[PDB]
Structures are given as C-alpha cells and as structure tokens.
C-alpha cells in the first residue's frame, strides 16, 4: 500500500531549430496528473487527472513558473555540459531529470530520490541518505563540487522528505476514489500452431493496475528463461496495463508447461496450464 510522487523532465537541444524542446510530467504512482510541453499552445502547467483540477489559480501559476524555471536551468546546463564533455554546438543533446518521494500506507516518508542524465547515461544522483552526491564520471564531478559548495543537497532534501511528502499526502486524499484502487490481472492462455509439429503458447495478463507484474514460464518444474519471449508491459490507455509471455513447444507436449502470474492484487499467485 505504498505510493510515490515523481516528476520527470526532458530537455533536448535543437541547434538552429529554436530553443530546446522541454517536456515535464508529474505522476502519482502510475497515474499522470500534470504536464508541461514547451511546444504546446497553453505554455502552462496543465491538469491530466480529474482530482488535480480543483487546485486554485495560485497553484497553477506557481507550478507554471517553477516548471519554466526548470526549463531555463536545463537550457543553461545543456551549454555547460557540452563544454564539460568537449562537444560541438552542432549536435542535439538531452538532459533528463527524475525526482520524487515514496510514502507508506500510513503516510510516513519512506525514501526520496533525484537522478540526472546526459545523452541517456547517468550524470549525477543524490544518494539515498539525501546528504551526498554520486557523479558518474570526472565531468559530472565538476557539478558535484559546485553543488556541495552551494549546499544544494540540504535544499533538495527539504523538498524530497518534506514538501514532496506534504503534497503527495494531499493528492492521495484528493484522488482517493481512484488512486487507492488496485486492479487484479485477468489471465488466459492462447495456443497458435507455427507448423505441423510446434505451437506457440502465450500467457496473457490484462487490465491490471499498478503496472508492476511478473510472468514466468516453467517446464516440468524447471524454468525456461532462455526460451521465453516476454514483451514490455504496456498501457491499455484506460489507466490499466497489459503484458504477455510466450514459449514455443512441441505439439502434444503442451501439458508440461505452466505460466505463473504475480501481481500485488492477486491473493495467491496464479498458475495456468494448457
């Protein structure tokens, strides 16, 4: 019964094609609730879940100003990191930032986090104690020295284990009719011949929330991690998720295979056999 609030930021330089594209999204658990897109018309932080719409004009103004300020910081940092990594001005580069906090079912703070990336690789991260940084390389250590001297971790910590928790608690109350619900996977198996002598068995998990789930194939007790096709968990688009796992088996031996399903919403793990 734990919950999370996370903000994701992406800035992408567009040399000669205008200012960097900037996209910010906020989630509670796996539910998006705010967005900002620099290429969108409104130029405002915008609601994306029904329970955030009740926030007042002061909230939307403040969130819009703060997210625009993040965009302006990233704009500067794109130039700075180009210098640190000795790159030219002609290429497109990417900064990604994620931060947020987890609370338990009783609302207590569990952990906070912040991680930054450059061109899709680790750049700098706040450590779990919220007091020290880990830089990924000698360039990122320049930033670390600057943030250590500016006592950035103390300011960030006050948000991650304080303000972040305050707002997450508020959102969980404001959105209780939806955020507290957990939808169990509906499971079935399908069978698809691929020749006269082999068939694909596919194990399906549908309509589940949250997205975390485990699907496993076993053959006569033993596992088949090397002979299993497993797709990425995917959104249905209605707020639930879907996944499947598949295995090619000899015709007439279907009974030797079992799919195993694990979801937080399942009282017991499900086992399916053809």
């Amino acid at each position: 019964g734990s919950h999370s609030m996370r903000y994701f930021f992406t800035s992408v330089s567009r040399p000669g094609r205008g200012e960097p594209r900037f996209i910010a999204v906020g989630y509670v658990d796996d539910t998006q609730f705010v967005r900002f897109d620099s290429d969108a018309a409104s130029q405002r932080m915008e609601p994306r879940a029904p329970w955030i719409e009740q926030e007042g004009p002061e909230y939307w103004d403040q969130e819009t100003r703060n997210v625009k300020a993040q965009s302006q910081t990233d704009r500067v940092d794109l130039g700075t990191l180009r210098g640190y990594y000795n790159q030219s001005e002609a290429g497109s580069h990417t900064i990604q930032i994620m931060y947020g906090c987890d609370v338990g079912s009783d609302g207590r703070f569990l952990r906070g986090y912040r991680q930054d990336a450059y061109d899709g690789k680790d750049y700098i991260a706040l450590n779990e104690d919220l007091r020290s940084w880990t830089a990924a390389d000698m360039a990122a250590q320049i930033t670390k020295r600057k943030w250590e001297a500016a006592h950035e971790a103390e300011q960030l910590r006050a948000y991650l284990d304080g303000t972040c928790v305050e707002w997450l608690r508020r959102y969980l109350e404001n959105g209780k009719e939806t955020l507290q619900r957990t939808d169990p996977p509906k499971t079935h198996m399908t069978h698809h011949p691929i020749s006269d002598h082999e068939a694909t068995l596919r194990c399906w998990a549908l309509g589940f929330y949250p997205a975390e789930i485990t699907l496993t194939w076993q053959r006569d007790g033993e596992d088949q991690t090397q002979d299993t096709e497993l797709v990425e968990t995917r959104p249905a688009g209605d707020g639930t998720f879907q996944k499947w796992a598949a295995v090619v088996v000899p015709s007439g031996e279907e009974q030797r295979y079992t799919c195993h399903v694990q979801h937080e919403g399942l009282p017991k793990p499900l086992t399916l056999r053809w």
Partner: peptide, 9 residues
C-alpha cells in the same frame, strides 16, 4: 507540486 529550487550544473 514540484521543487522550486535551481542551481545550475
């Protein structure tokens, strides 16, 4: 609500 604080890199 997200964080209102920014030191550049």
């Amino acid at each position: 609500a997200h964080h209102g604080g920014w030191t550049t890199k």
